[PDB]
């Protein structure tokens, strides 16, 4: 039985209503729950969903050099596959493998409706509206590593901001936007942003274009016999239009705004 690391993130992995009464994998629903089922069917494996204990995507400690989050679970052999909205990055590719992308996305800006912001330049040239990102993920790293002037300005602000503009989870960032009367904006991937925009109370929206262009991949530890089957499975699902059906199912069919 293959241990699948994933993260509680709507609409990828969520608790079913009355999840307490279900056992194991049956506790959960979402895009990545369906993707896990599809891949397992294609490659012929039994699997168990294990929600990442620390609740993080994955970053390397510049102190102890230890990987946390889902990346950590793979690196240290606690899980055999990661089926979550895990961004394909250089630093991660150096320690784990990724399938070709199952979803295409970029960093985006979330505002409370009515906020006078339409771009990253708009954010960077003012101080009245605060903004941040989730911790321990690719978005925080993006700003840390950027040599593009606008993003460097944004990082210089966010890195030193008090109280902290970095949130433990995406949900916490969204809640912060919703409660802050337009005085907090949140930087997050377009996929999560677009989802939230179609959820009650319909008070947030994505503004401007994406800051970058990248993808989520299904990840496996280096040397895994699952590497190739997983990659081919993702491409088959892509080409058969199943990934498009799954996105429509979890983002728009369920649309509430």
Ligand X SMILES: N[C@@H](CCC(=O)O)C(=O)O
- Would you say 190 is a known binding-site residue? no
Residue 134 interacts with, from its own copies, ligand X, none (CB under 5-8 Å by kind): ligand X
Q: How many residues bind ligand X (CB under 6 A)?
A: 10
Burial of 256: CB neighbours in 10 Å, binned 0-12, 13-18, 19+:
exposed
Q: Which long-range contacts (CB under 8 A, 24 or more apart) does 21-25 make?
A: 24/48, 24/49, 25/49
Distance, in Å, from the CA atom of 171 to the CA atom of 246, rounded to the nearest integer, reads 22
Nearer to ligand X, 27 or 60 (CB): 60
Q: State the nearest-atom distance from the C-beta of 46 to ligand X, in Å.
A: 26
- Would you say 138 is a known binding-site residue? yes
Q: State the nearest-atom distance from the C-beta of 225 to its own copies, in Å.
A: 17
Q: Scanning residues 177 to 196, which ones bind ligand X (CB under 6 A)?
A: 188-189
Residue 139 lies near ligand X (rule: CB under 6 A): yes
Distance, in Å, from the CA atom of 68 to the CA atom of 2, rounded to the nearest integer, reads 20
- Would you say 87 is a known binding-site residue? yes
Q: What are the strands, taking DSSP E only, across the chain?
A: 2-6, 14-15, 28-29, 47-51, 81-82, 96-98, 103-105, 107-112, 130-132, 184-189, 204-207, 214-216, 219-221
Residue of 72, 137, 173, 217 interacting with ligand X (CB under 6 A): 137
Structure-token pair, residue 86? 């895990």
Binding site for its own copies (CB under 8 A): 88-90, 93-94, 98, 100-101, 104, 142, 145-148, 212-215, 217, 231-232, 235-236, 238-241, 243-244
Contacts of residue 242, Cβ cutoff 8 Å, sequence gap at least 6: 38
Q: State the nearest-atom distance from the C-beta of 61 to ligand X, in Å.
A: 15
CB crowding 145-167: b at 16 or more within 10 Å, else e: ebeeebbebbbebbeeeeeebbb
- Would you say 64 is a known binding-site residue? no
Residue 57 lies near ligand X (rule: CB under 6 A): yes
Nearer to its own copies, 55 or 215 (CB): 215
Beta strands 28-29 and 81-82 are unpaired
Residues facing residue 204 across a β-bridge: 112
Nearer to its own copies, 17 or 147 (CB): 147
Q: Scanning residues 58 to 117, which ones bind ligand X (CB under 6 A)?
A: 85-87
Q: State the nearest-atom distance from the C-beta of 211 to ligand X, in Å.
A: 11
Distance, in Å, from the CA atom of 197 to the CA atom of 254, rounded to the nearest integer, reads 12
Residue 122 lies near ligand X (rule: CB under 6 A): no
Q: Which residues are annotated as part of the binding site? A: 85, 87, 92, 138-139, 189
Q: Which residues bind ligand X (CB under 6 A)?
A: 57, 85-87, 134, 137-139, 188-189
Residues forming the annotated binding site for L-glutamate?
85, 87, 92, 138-139, 189
């Amino acid at each position: 039985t293959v241990v699948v690391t994933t993260i509680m993130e709507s609409p990828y992995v969520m608790y079913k209503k009355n999840h307490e009464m279900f056992e194991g994998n049956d506790k959960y629903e979402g895009y990545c729950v369906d993707l896990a089922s599809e891949i397992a069917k294609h490659i012929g494996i039994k699997y168990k969903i294990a929600i990442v204990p620390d609740g993080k995507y994955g970053a390397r400690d510049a102190d102890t050099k230890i990987w946390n989050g889902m990346v950590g679970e793979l690196v240290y052999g606690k899980a055999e596959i990661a089926i979550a909205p895990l961004t394909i990055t250089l630093v991660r590719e150096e320690v784990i493998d990724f399938s070709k992308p199952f979803m295409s996305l970029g960093i985006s800006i979330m505002i409370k409706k009515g906020t006078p912001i339409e771009s990253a330049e708009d954010l960077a040239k003012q101080t009245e509206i605060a903004y941040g990102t989730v911790d321990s993920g690719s978005t925080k790293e993006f700003f840390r590593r950027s040599k593009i002037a606008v993003y460097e300005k944004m990082w210089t602000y966010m890195r030193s901001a008090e109280p902290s503009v970095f949130t433990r989870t995406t949900a916490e960032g969204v809640a912060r936007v919703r409660k802050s009367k337009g005085k907090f904006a949140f930087l997050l991937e377009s996929t999560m942003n677009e989802y939230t925009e179609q959820r009650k109370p319909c008070d947030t929206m994505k503004v401007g274009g994406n800051l970058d262009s990248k993808g989520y991949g299904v990840a496996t530890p280096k040397g895994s016999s699952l590497r190739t089957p997983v990659n081919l499975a993702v491409l088959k699902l892509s080409e058969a239009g199943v990934l498009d059906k799954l996105k429509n199912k979890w983002w728009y069919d369920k649309g509430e705004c």
